[PDB]
From Swiss-Prot:
It catalyses: L-cysteine + O2 = 3-sulfino-L-alanine + H(+). There is a cross-link at residues 89-153 (3'-(S-cysteinyl)-tyrosine (Cys-Tyr)). It holds the Pfam family CDO_I. Belongs to the cysteine dioxygenase family. Catalyzes the oxidation of cysteine to cysteine sulfinic acid with addition of molecular dioxygen. This is Cysteine dioxygenase type 1. Its cofactor is Fe cation; Ni(2+); Zn(2+). Induction: By increase of sulfur amino acid intake. The thioether cross-link between Cys-89 and Tyr-153 plays a structural role through stabilizing the Fe(2+) ion, and prevents the production of highly damaging free hydroxyl radicals by holding the oxygen radical via hydroxyl hydrogen. CDD domains: cupin_CDO.
Amino acid sequence: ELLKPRTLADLIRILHELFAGDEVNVEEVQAVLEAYESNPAEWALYAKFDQYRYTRNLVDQGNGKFNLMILCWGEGHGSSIHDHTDSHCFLKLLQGNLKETLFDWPDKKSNEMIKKSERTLRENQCAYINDSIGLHRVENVSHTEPAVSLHLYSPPFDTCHAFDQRTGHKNKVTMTFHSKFGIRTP
Ligand SMILES: [Fe+2]
């Protein structure tokens, strides 16, 4: 029975229960993420920014079924176009706005990937992506407001592919945590 999380802690407890089994219910997960009201005090600790690019901050390793991490996007910061390694990927805005651009999987040819769709994700909004849906690029296009987001991936994945918008070629990148449980990890 899905309850409203009062707090991040609560949220994380509910997530552990939802992931106790081995097959997830995406809707239910998205609904509890959406229902958590962003409270900066509760996650301030994980919101470590870098001047030059966005940072991944590990919050919870999830008894091995999922990662939960906070990302921090300075003004004009953005990701590349990427997939999610056959995993589920939820994303909640805790603060600010991100622009998400979805691409279709490139065909084997070398041509400019073309954007399926585009949308702004607002605070507390929770979005869901997986590889059957497509690839996406997330950016903070704001010139004045940093953005912070909450990301859940299940199962956890170390690496993903990044795509060249031009040719659609892809590289395996190994995602690195800026911090882990509130501790900076170079
Ligand atoms: Fe992503």
